[PDB]
């Protein structure tokens, strides 16, 4: 199993957390660890037939899987972390789609755009509230059902990425803060985090 | 004179170049050199009355100036580098506007958005093209007149900035390239640059 992406988190960290959580081994190929990233990328697209000329690409054998979102749903169904019912499969999928929304906003805010304030003070809190509510409904902390699913990992990864840029706003959201801390303490993810 | 902004280039670097080219000493207040950049900024918005709560703001005496573009045009008139005729003052302005459009596109391209290769392949070459044609119409040192204007500093800032994230494609644009080395060598500029 080989994962191809740039030497960064971005859209590939969630897949790496899945592999870690589940503990399945693989080769983490990162473009630009030493060389120029774009040349390494430009040359990967030659030697490899990609659907949409974009990474991440997860290679299992001679099989090429593309599109991060599609890749995690696949891994999740195959390894039972997508929920145990029609309905719950849907709810996980639903919150995951929610995570993409705000995660994008996040990656679309920066100094030059003078965008940082309205995100930090408006979009971020609003959305953290949406997640609290979902935790409140399902009331050890899981978003869906009674066992862990990729939605729990995606939410976690979301805030973990946000905090690398901005201060930890989770003070006002106790359940979201707890959930975040809980999955970060899971022995398997905890080891990965420390080795990053 | 006090220039306020975050400890970054962003939209304040052009103003810092103007001050360097003209050898004007001022104070470069950079939020974050001490504590939470957002803390100082938040306190800054309390002590100073900003029109739109955005930085940079330039404080000359007791008056505060607020919009980076409006500030550069202001400084340029006051120090004669805005051109020496109506048409030329207009051209500098036009070139400057074009620089903003692509400078924004640049600061709006990241790994997550999978914006990058399309910027380097479609956008950048198309724009470098326009600037080459422009310098051609003025036949290897200036965009407007026989003298230096803020348009020149704006185009050089632009590429010096792009060059800290992406390659250096100026090869296929000879006048653009000569233009940028030309101003990168101006005594005052080479000095500021080496001390950044």
Curated annotation (Swiss-Prot), chains A, B:
Keywords: Transferase. Residues 85-196 form the GST C-terminal domain. Changing residue 11 to E: 10-fold decrease in substrate affinity and 20-fold decrease in activity. One of its GO terms (molecular function) is glutathione transferase activity. Glutathione binds at residues 54-55, 67-68, 101, 113, 117. Disulfide bonds: none annotated. Inhibited by chloroquine, cibacron blue, ferriprotoporphyrin IX (hemin) and S-hexylglutathione. This is Glutathione S-transferase. It comes from Plasmodium falciparum (isolate 3D7).
């Amino acid at each position: 199993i080989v994962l191809y992406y740039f030497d960064a988190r971005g859209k590939a960290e969630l897949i790496r957390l899945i592999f870690a959580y589940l503990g399945i081994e693989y080769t983490d190929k990162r473009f630009g660890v030493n060389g120029d990233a774009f040349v390494e990328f430009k040359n990967f697209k030659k030697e490899k037939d990609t659907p949409f000329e974009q990474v991440p690409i997860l290679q299992i054998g001679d099989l090429i899987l593309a599109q991060s979102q599609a890749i995690v749903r696949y891994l999740s169904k195959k390894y039972n972390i997508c929920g145990e019912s029609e309905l719950n499969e849907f709810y996980a999928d639903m919150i995951f789609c929610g995570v993409q929304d705000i995660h994008y906003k996040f990656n679309n805010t920066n100094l030059f755009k003078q965008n940082e304030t309205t995100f930090l003070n408006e979009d971020l809190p609003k959305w953290s509230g949406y997640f609290e509510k979902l935790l409140k409904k399902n009331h050890k902390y899981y978003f869906v059902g009674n066992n862990l699913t990729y939605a729990d990992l995606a939410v976690f990864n979301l805030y973990d990425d946000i905090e690398t840029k901005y201060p930890s706003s989770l003070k006002n959201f106790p359940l979201l803060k707890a959930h975040n801390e809980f999955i970060s303490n899971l022995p398997n993810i905890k080891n990965y985090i420390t080795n990053r």
